[PDB]
Amino acid sequence: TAYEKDKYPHLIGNSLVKKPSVAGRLQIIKQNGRRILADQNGEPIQLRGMSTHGLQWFPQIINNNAFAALANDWGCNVIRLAMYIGEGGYATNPQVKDKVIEGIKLAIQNDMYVIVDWHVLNPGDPNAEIYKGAKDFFKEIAQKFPNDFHIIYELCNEPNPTDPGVTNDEAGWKKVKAYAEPIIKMLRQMGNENIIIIGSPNWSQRPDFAIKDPIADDKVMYSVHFYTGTHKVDGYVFENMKMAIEAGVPVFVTEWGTSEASGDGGPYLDEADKWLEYLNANNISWVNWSLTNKNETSGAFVPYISGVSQATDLDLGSDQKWDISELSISGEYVRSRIKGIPYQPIERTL
Ligand SMILES: [Ca+2]
Numbered sequence: 001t002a003y004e005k006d007k008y009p010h011l012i013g014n015s016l017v018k019k020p021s022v023a024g025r026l027q028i029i030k031q032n033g034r035r036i037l038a039d040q041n042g043e044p045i046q047l048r049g050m051s052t053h054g055l056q057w058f059p060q061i062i063n064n065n066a067f068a069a070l071a072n073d074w075g076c077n078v079i080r081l082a083m084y085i086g087e088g089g090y091a092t093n094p095q096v097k098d099k100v101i102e103g104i105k106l107a108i109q110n111d112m113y114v115i116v117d118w119h120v121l122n123p124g125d126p127n128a129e130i131y132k133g134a135k136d137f138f139k140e141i142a143q144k145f146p147n148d149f150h151i152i153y154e155l156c157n158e159p160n161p162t163d164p165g166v167t168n169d170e171a172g173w174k175k176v177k178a179y180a181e182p183i184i185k186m187l188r189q190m191g192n193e194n195i196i197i198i199g200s201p202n203w204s205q206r207p208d209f210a211i212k213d214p215i216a217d218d219k220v221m222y223s224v225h226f227y228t229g230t231h232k233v234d235g236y237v238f239e240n241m242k243m244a245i246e247a248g249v250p251v252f253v254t255e256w257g258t259s260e261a262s263g264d265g266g267p268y269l270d271e272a273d274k275w276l277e278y279l280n281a282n283n284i285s286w287v288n289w290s291l292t293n294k295n296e297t298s299g300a301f302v303p304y305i306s307g308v309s310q311a312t313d314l315d316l317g318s319d320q321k322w323d324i325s326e327l328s329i330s331g332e333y334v335r336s337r338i339k340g341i342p343y344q345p346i347e348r349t350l
Pocket residue numbers: 059060061062063
C-alpha cells in the first residue's frame with residue numbers, strides 16, 4: 001500500500017544508515033565508477049541526519065535528551081553543528097564555540113557522527129577578513145578531539161557571490177581551494193584522517209569543479225546544497241550534482257531543505273521525494289535544515305505563532321522523543337525519511 005514502494009523504492013529502508021559503533025572509521029571507496037563513503041570494512045554507508053540552525057540563535061537544541069531522540073527515535077547517524085561567524089556568530093560572540101564543543105561530545109555520547117560546520121554565508125568569500133579565525137578554529141577542535149573518527153569537518157558552508165564574494169566560475173573555485181588547502185594540510189600534518197567536506201561557488205551548487213580541478217586529498221568530499229521549493233530534479237543544481245557524481249566526484253549533501261532557499265515556503269514534499277530517491281539510490285549522504293522552532297517552513301519543530309501555537313521546546317525531557325504533533329510538517333516528513341519508514345502524515349486541523 002505505501003506509495004513509495006512502487007514509485008520511490010529507495011525511500012524505504014535504513015540498513016546502510018550505520019552508526020559509529022558499527023561502522024567505525026569512514027573512508028572513500030571507488031565502486032563502479034563512483035567514489036562513495038564507506039565504513040571501516042569497506043561496505044557502503046549512508047549518513048542521514050539533521051543540522052542545527054545557527055548556534056548563536058538556537059543553541060537550545062544542544063541537550064542530551066534531544067540528541068538521544070534524534071539518534072534513537074529518528075534514527076539519525078549524523079548531526080551537523082552550524083557555527084555562523086558573521087551575523088552575531090563566532091566573530092563577535094566566540095562563546096558559541098563552547099556550544100559546538102558540547103555538541104560534538106553529545107553526538108559522540110549518543111552514537112552519531114558529527115559535522116563541524118564553519119558556516120560561511122554572509123559574506124560569500126571564505127577568505128574574507130571576517131573569517132580569519134577559521135584555521136585556528138579547526139586547529140582547536142582537532143586539538144580537543146585528535147583524529148576522532150566521529151568528526152567530519154566542513155570548512156566553508158556556502159561560498160557565494162555576496163560581497164566580498166566568489167564568482168560562479170573557475171576563478172571562484174580557485175579562491176575556495178586557496179582557502180581550504182592550507183587548513184586541510186594543517187589537519188593532515190597533525191594526524192587527522194577525518195573526512196573533510198568542501199563547498200563551492202553559487203552557494204555550494206558547483207561540485208562539478210572537482211571533476212577537472214579536485215583537491216588532491218583522498219578523504220575530501222564536495223558539498224551540494226538544495227532547497228526543494230527552489231531547486232528541482234533535472235534543474236541546474238541537480239544536474240551539476242549528477243554530473244559530478246557520474247564523473248567520480250565524492251559528493252555529500254551537508255544541507256538541504258523542504259522549503260524555498262530562503263528557509264520558508266511550502267513545504268515541497270513531492271519534490272523532496274524525487275531528490276531523496278535519487279540520493280538514496282546513489283549512496284549520497286544527506287543532512288536536513290534545520291533543528292529550529294523558528295517560524296519558517298524548513299524548521300523541524302512547531303513554532304510560536306501568535307493566535308495559533310506555542311513553540312515546541314528544543315530542550316527535551318527524559319522521554320527522549322517529541323510527539324509528532326510537536327514536529328512541523330517538514331520535521332515529521334524528514335523524520336520518516338531518516339528512519340526509512342513510509343510517509344504517513346498526521347492531520348493538522350486547528
Ligand atoms: Ca543545553
